[PDB]
Every structure is written in structure tokens, then in C-alpha cells.
Design a protein around this ligand. Sequence first.
Ligand SMILES: CCCCCCCCCCCCCCCCCCCC(=O)O[C@H](COC(=O)CCCCCCCCCCCCCC)COP(=O)(O)OCCN
Ligand SMILES: CCCCCCCCCCCCCCCCCCCC(=O)O[C@H](COC(=O)CCCCCCCCCCCCCC)COP(=O)(O)OCCN
Lengths: 539, 539
Amino acid sequence: KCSNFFANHWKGLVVFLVPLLCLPVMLLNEGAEFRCMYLLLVMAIFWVTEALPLYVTSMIPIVAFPIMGIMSSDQTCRLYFKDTLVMFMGGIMVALAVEYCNLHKRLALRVIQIVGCSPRRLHFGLIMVTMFLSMWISNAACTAMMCPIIQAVLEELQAQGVCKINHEPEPPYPTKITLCYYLGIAYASSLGGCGTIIGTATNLTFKGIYEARFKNSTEQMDFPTFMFYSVPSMLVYTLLTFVFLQWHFMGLWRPKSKEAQEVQRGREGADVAKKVIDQRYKDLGPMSIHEIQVMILFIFMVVMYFTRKPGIFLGWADLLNSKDIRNSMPTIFVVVMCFMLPANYAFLRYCTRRGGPVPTGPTPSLITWKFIQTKVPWGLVFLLGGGFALAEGSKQSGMAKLIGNALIGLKVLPNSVLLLVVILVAVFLTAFSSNVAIANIIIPVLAEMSLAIEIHPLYLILPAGLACSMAFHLPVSTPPNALVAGYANIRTKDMAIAGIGPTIITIITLFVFCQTWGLVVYPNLNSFPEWAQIYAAAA
Amino acid sequence: KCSNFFANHWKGLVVFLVPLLCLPVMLLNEGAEFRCMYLLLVMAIFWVTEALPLYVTSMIPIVAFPIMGIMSSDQTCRLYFKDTLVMFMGGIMVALAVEYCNLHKRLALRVIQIVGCSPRRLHFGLIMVTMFLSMWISNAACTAMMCPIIQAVLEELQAQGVCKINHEPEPPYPTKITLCYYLGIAYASSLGGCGTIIGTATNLTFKGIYEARFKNSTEQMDFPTFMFYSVPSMLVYTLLTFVFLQWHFMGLWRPKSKEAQEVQRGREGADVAKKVIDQRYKDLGPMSIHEIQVMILFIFMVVMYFTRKPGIFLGWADLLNSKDIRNSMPTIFVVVMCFMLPANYAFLRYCTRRGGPVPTGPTPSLITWKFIQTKVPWGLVFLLGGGFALAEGSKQSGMAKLIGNALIGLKVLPNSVLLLVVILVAVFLTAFSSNVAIANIIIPVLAEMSLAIEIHPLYLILPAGLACSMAFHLPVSTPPNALVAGYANIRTKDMAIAGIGPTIITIITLFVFCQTWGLVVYPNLNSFPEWAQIYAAAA
Ligand SMILES: CCCCCCCCCCCCCCCCCCCC(=O)O[C@H](COC(=O)CCCCCCCCCCCCCC)COP(=O)(O)OCCN
Ligand SMILES: CCCCCCCCCCCCCCCCCCCC(=O)O[C@H](COC(=O)CCCCCCCCCCCCCC)COP(=O)(O)OCCN
């Protein structure tokens, strides 16, 4: 009776009680920094617990700041919808354009065909394609995009009878092979998300917070530099994750294991079956002009990103130095070009070369607004903006200096220990909640702590920002885990056991690579730069 | 052959040719204001013609301005998503919450029950309810909300056989009664849109442009003052539109007319029939706590709008004088409170008075995020932002001074003829295209022309801003017209012949009321205020 009441209505209890319980923080102390602290506590608890939808919770600052003596209404709204957010939303639109007309399927099928027929080889190909696609597209999208192929091939293999998808006789228990495939897809999506700024929202969040906090910083997380910093480690731990997954389920190094016998059986007689099903499933047809135009536009957008400000040559931006151009212009330009261009080029028959029937109606464009309006996750605007506004208000109120003075005690420990504990704390926190919320909560605190001690802010911000995305244990940790658990009825215990490998691999790889190669990309990480001294002295 | 080629593919021809044709404007003159003028011409032609979707076209300034010397990328994105736009979007969300749980149906049915039984009385009540609903909600939404009731009552009457929906024998021709009802609903929605700032987008557009251009203006279009200025005229010409429709289709003043004889039959019988069917739709069950909570929240929001800064008493926004609240808090506050509050209060059986069964799951909130995400027209953000950015860029580049000096020749004519010609031009232009585009095009030009001559800007801005919404002649003019034409297969010729009336009525009413009662609400229209003199002298 009374026990299940907490089980059903705990969210309402949190919503009702937390604002009342946190009130003495405001009443006891007089400064406005304490009001900002009260707001921070309430919003952090709402994000972690998820009592309210994240998008709704992100709207609180609009109400809260003008009531208090923090910010005016117009400035708070200006903090939302920065140019960087426009770049991200345009990137989502271009990804939608790619998804439309089915370019992704052609790329995935071709790479799998290039990779070998053996079942171990098929797993390797699937992970690599997912990592490359998640590098530019949202993670949950990529998981949904990739699952049907493996589902179809597994069903065909079961039809031949070489392997069984489920245990023979409460949903049926999945076998080891399907667990391996699905978990590999989800993990590959999560790992590949970290490669690029537009790969996932968390990268955008901490990049934006760092840029807003320190305008005078001489080290920049622009698009090429971040990609240079991130790609090699991503490749290394993706490969190591693949090796660990093969060891855990396929019996890679144990020849006498019974699991290895199943792999050997799959090697002989199932290669032809999956090859036939893959060839038939690649029946899209000859490559149309639609896909060619979309691909050319995408490549042009990437090239525009890379050419904005290289050290080799001036490039654009330097030539157009009248005003400050940003990477927002290349994206929106691609979106507009996608809307203007046609899709068939069949109307040329009118002017000359009257071969074939003329079109009977208006030629469709590359994309339609109805598709965009129904698929874009518009709440990300409020979520990212709320993070930015909270950071800015915390800076202006002066509560950031209060935390900075509070945490000064950590100066005793050496830098490496700080790096390790920061990574561990970030992983532990992101295990239980959304990545973006954890990033918003922890990044400004790290910035202020790094200012209080004499440590370069990037040296702590980058590893933590990357580590916030590493979530593998529980279904609640990340949406791809929930989708994969739903598709194949994966029990939580098995996923929790399997998640041990990627966590250790990512932690070790991040530690070593940030210690070694970050100095190669950023020479001044070890020392304390001049502008950091100026900022700390002003603080 | 070649004749139909223009019919099929004219939009692509416009998109390809117009930028090439307007290019000599940029090449011949070296000023940056000429580049801004080229941009203005291109966007104006794209909006009027609708070669591209409006939302896509509004995205051009983000790409265009930083390339030229007009503005930086950061500021251009800041221009989008202002405070006022956030207020409007929150208002749309609250309207969606009202649509949820079906409060509007109860209100409309109750008012129709209050009004009498004769078809004239039913028509009058239906128009009044449509006007009141459109005062707070989008026009097309209200039309879709209201049509099914009249459809049902007409079908029931046809089943009884008192009147025929369509002419007896290509879609069937609707009879005069059906035309009257549907056209009345559409016209009522269009007319009631003008009552309030959040009623329609055009009001928001010109209010925002005026506020951005003149910060120092003493006269203000705040929420209560605008409503005071607008409501009485709205009532007068809504009533006059009702009388014209009754004379045109139901022979109100002519007893001998056959149409009057059909009305007499409708009064003699079947009034009890429509009353019975109306009661059947009224049986929605007793009013629930859900609706009561939503209604209380809505009333509280409106009261919060009025008490922001009244002349009678200080109110809020003066007690909290640390920052300018700027009327954004109430709307987002209501949106958040909609998610926070429950919907049943059936969980209290746990504590005491067990009574009925306890709930078996979490209690739903007043609204769900899925409903909001799928129904909000998100492209309005880009449309309004593009309008604001174009206005600001025109101000900064210096094109405004050029146009104002160009149009100085109109000083010869007296004030009244300027008012009349402005109203006529606004109506003629809005007849053929979207209202928001016309407002965006014409408002800044009016502001600059008003500065060039010694005329108070409001004197011309308000009548034109209201006149942009008056569109009845063609289905292209406004979405409600298209919906009504689709529902009842209305022919365009009949629609124009019917709409000839409300145009004249609205023009005369606006002229007289703006000349007479605007002085009562704003005392200083006739004179040229000091701040206007300062602005003109500086510019
Ligand atoms: C200078 C000083 C300034 C101080 C400023 C302070 C500002 C504070 C602002 C926030 C104040 C609290 C707001 C609470 C809103 C209502 C929350 C109700 C949640 C609820 O339904 O809880 C149920 C259990 O309630 C319980 O167990 C508790 C009993 C709840 C009874 C109803 C309470 C709300 C009644 C109206 C209060 C007044 C509102 C207007 C101010 C379970 O809900 P669930 O989990 O099943 O579903 C939840 C999703 N729907
Ligand atoms: C020095 C500074 C200068 C600054 C100012 C200039 C800046 C750049 C301006 C660029 C403007 C856009 C250029 C590309 C527009 C392409 C539009 C094509 C539209 C189209 O398909 O038109 C069809 C007929 O075209 C026709 O009959 C038109 C002629 C033939 C068009 C096809 C061949 C060209 C294809 C595009 C080449 C682009 C090259 C440059 C990137 C009918 O289409 P529809 O109406 O049935 O369907 C339309 C679905 N949206």
C-alpha cells in the first residue's frame, strides 16, 4: 500500500519539496550570489532527477533572473540562440537532408561489401561504419538507422539455420551473438559521437561555455583544431573496444571454448547466405543525381569549415575582414542551396533534345520543409540556451568566485591526480543521467577551480568534456542504450557486466593521450599562460 | 507545349533570374547601402512571389550580412529570438494547453446555447464566439476548431430535410446558406485577429519594428494601451460585417426575396432540431478540475499583463525595479506551471479518506511535451527574426536615410490623403501575399517617410499595421480563406463578390476611428513631438 505510493508519485514529491527545502540558503545569507546558488541547486536537482522534462526545466532562468537582481529580460533572451547554436541546428538540418533520399544506406552497404564475409569481419565493418556516421549525426538517429540491416541478416541466417537469434524455451533471452552485434552498434555510436563538434550536443556545450568564459584565451577550440585533437584517440579506443567485444562474446583468444565453435560454424556455410541477402538488400538502383548533389554540398560544407582560418594561407574570413564571419554562414548557405536546387533536371527536354516525356508537374527540391519541421528536436534550443544562460549568470553574480575560493584546498595534489579524479567523477556522474545536464553542471565549476589554482583551464576542461560522453552501463545512461535494450530485450545485468571493458579502455586512453599528445597539439598546456594570470588577478 | 512550361516551372525561373537581374544595382553604385538595397529587393520579391518557403527565405540575412560590411555574425543571430518573440511563442504554447482538455468546445457551445434559436441568431452567436476565440489564438487554428460544429448542424438539418447543403445537379455548388456560414466564420477569425498583440503575427511584427526603431519614444504600444486602442473599432466593424452578410445571402431587408422565405421556413421549423443536436454535443460530461486549473492559469496570466505598469497604482515591475522585467515572465511562468501541476488529485486517497481506488500509475500533467513539439509552427521564429534583422540592417547601413530623402516630395499633400493612400496601398498589397511579408516590407519605409516629413510616426504606422490584416477577396490572401474554400468547395468569383463589402467597411471604420478616437487614447498625434524632432535632426 503505502510502499507503492512512493514508487508511483516520487517525482511530484521532489517537485514539491526541493524548492521548499533549499529556501534557507536564500534566507540565511544576504548576497545575490546566494540566490544564484539556490537557483543552481534547484536546476541541478531537476536535471539529475528528471522530475520535469529537460526542455521545460531549461526555461526557468527566463523567469528567475529578472525577478532577482541578476539580469534583465532582454539580455537573458539574447543569451539563448547564439550563432553557435544556429550552426548546430543547421548541421542537424543537413544531416536530415542526407538521411532523406537514402545516401547513408548506400555508404553502409558498400563498406560492408568491401569488408570480408567472415562473421567477425562483419562485426568490425558494422562498428566502423557506425563510428563514421555518428561522427556527423546524432547518436540515437544512427542507431535507429543501422539496426534494421543487422536484424534482416540475422533473420535470414536463422532461416537457413546456421545460428539462432534467441535461446530455445517473459520475452525470449537473446543469445551471445545478437548481444554482441547490438551492443557493438550502440557503443560504436557513443564512441564516434565524440569525434566532431557537430557529432553530439555535449561537445557544443562545453566548447560554448569555455569560449564565453574566456574571450581573451590564445588557445581556440575551432573546428579543425578540435578534430585534430580528438580523432586519433577516438580511433584507438574504438579499435580496443572492438577487440574487447570480440574477446568477451566470440571467444577470440580461447579456441577450445564452445563459443568459438559457433563462430567456426558461422564461418563455413553462412558467408554465402549473408552475402546473398546483402546483395539483394543493396537493390536501391543506379546512383541518382539527387544523391550526387547532396554529397557535393556536404563535401563543400566540410571544406568551407577547414579553410576558414588555416596557418598555411589566409583563406576566407581573413579576406572578408570587414566584419567577423563565423562557421554559421557555411551551414545555412548549404541549407538554402538545398532548398533552391532541383532534383531531376528533366525539364531540359523542353529547351532542346526532346527525348523522353516532359514532367507533368513542378519538380521537387532536394528537401521539403514538412520533413524538417517534423523531425528536428526543437527542445535542444531551450536546453543549450539554458546551459549558456546559467553559466553567464553564475559569472556575473559573483558566485563563481565564491566556489573558486571554496575549492582552493585541492592545491596540494599533483596535476595527474587531479586529471584522474576529474575523469572518474565525470564518468560516475554521467552514468546516471543525461550527458548535457552533467556537462552544464560541472564545466563552470572546473573553470573556476582551474582559475583558483595555477592550472591551464583546457588541461582539465577537455578531458572532462570528452569523458562526459562515455556512458555504457545502464539503459538510463544514454538514449542509444535504451533503444538497443528495447529492440533485443537486453536485460540490465548483462549490459552492466559488459560495460566494464569500454569504461576502463576509455579512461586509460584519455589519460595517456591527454598527457602525451595534447602537448603536441597545444604546446602551452603544462605552463600557466599570461592571460590566465591576468584573469585570476582580476578575479 | 511551350506554353505550359511557364505554368509548371515559373518558380525556378524566378529564383534563377531575379538575383542576376538585380545585380547592376550593386555594381553601378559603390555604397554599402546599395548592397543592402539589392538584398532588400531580392527578399521582397521572394516573399511576394513565394518562390521559396517563407521560413527558408527569412534565413538569408544570416548568410548575407556578414559577407557584406553590414553586421557581424554574432549580432545578426542576436537579432533573432528577441524577448517579444519568446512572449509570442509562450502564448502559442498556452493556447495549445487551452486546446488540450477541450475548454474551447465548452465555451463555444455554452455561448451558442445562450444565444437564440433562429438561424440569424445562430449565425450572430457563431461569429461572436469565433471573434473572441481568434482574439487569443491563431486564425487558421480557430477556423479548424470551429468548422465541425456548423458542419454537423447543417448535416442534421439536411437529414431532416428543411434545407439543402448543396444545389441539386465537378464538385457540387454550395447553396447560399452554407456560403454565408463558412465565409462568416473565416471573416470573423480574420477580424478578431486584430484585437490583441498575441492575436496574430502581424501585430507583433510592426510593434517590434516600431519599438526597435524608436527607443526614446514617449508613446508606447504596451499590452493594455494597444488593446484599448483596438477593441472598440474591432467591435464596430465586426458588427457591420455581420449585417452585410445577412443582407447579401439571407435577404435581411427584403421580405419578398426567396432567401427571406427560406429563412422564414428555418424559423418556423427545425429550430428545435438544431437545439437537440446542440445539446447532444453539449453533453461532454461535467466540467473537470483539469479545465478549472487551466482557466484559472489563463485568467491569472491576463491579469498579470494588465497590472504590469498601470497609471492608477505602482504594481509590480516597479516594486522589482532592479531590472526591466519587460513582461516576459508571466507567459513562461504559466508554461512551466502547466507542467508542474497534476491533473486528477486522486492520489490524496492514500493519506486519508480512501474512498475510491488509488491510481495505478503516475498522474499526468496538464500538458505533455509531445503535444507541444508536434503542433507549434517553429518556422515563425525564422520569419520574425528575418523581419527584425532586415529592419535593423536597413537602419544601420544608411539606406533608410536615402529612402526618406527620396520620398520627401509627398509633403505637398494634406494629412488625410496620406492616411487614406497608405491604407489603400496596404490593403491592395496584402490582397496577394502573406500578411507578415507585407508588414515587413512596408513598415520601415513608412517610419522613414514619417521622419522625413514632420509627421508623428504612430499616425501612419498604426492604421497601416492594422490594415495589413484585412484580406478577404482571394484564397491566396490568408490561410483561413484557403481552409474555408477547401471545406465547402467555394468558387473564387463568388468569394470575391462576397468579400467586396468588408473591405469597404474596414477602410471607412479605420479611417474614422483613427482620426477621432486615437487622439483620445493618445493625445499628441497631431503635433510633432520633441523626441521626433531630435531623431530627425540627428538623422
Ligand atoms: C521571499 C520568499 C520567496 C519564496 C519563493 C518560493 C517559491 C517556490 C516555488 C515553488 C513552490 C511549489 C510549487 C508546487 C506546485 C505543485 C506541485 C504538485 C506536485 C504533485 O502533484 O505531487 C503529487 C504528490 O504531492 C504531494 O505529496 C504533496 C501535496 C501536493 C498538494 C498540491 C500542492 C499544490 C497546490 C497549489 C499550490 C499553490 C500553487 C500556486 C503558487 C504527486 O504527483 P505525481 O508524481 O503523481 O505527478 C507529477 C506530475 N504531474
Ligand atoms: C560577383 C558577386 C555576385 C553576387 C550575386 C550572385 C550571388 C550568387 C547567386 C546564386 C543564385 C542561385 C543560383 C542557382 C539557382 C538554381 C535554381 C534552379 C531552379 C530550377 O530548377 O529551375 C527550373 C527551370 O530553370 C530554368 O529554366 C533556369 C535556367 C536553367 C537552370 C538549370 C541550370 C543551372 C543549375 C544550377 C547551377 C548553379 C551554379 C552556381 C552554383 C524549374 O524548376 P522548378 O520550378 O520546376 O522546381 C524548383 C524547385 N526548387
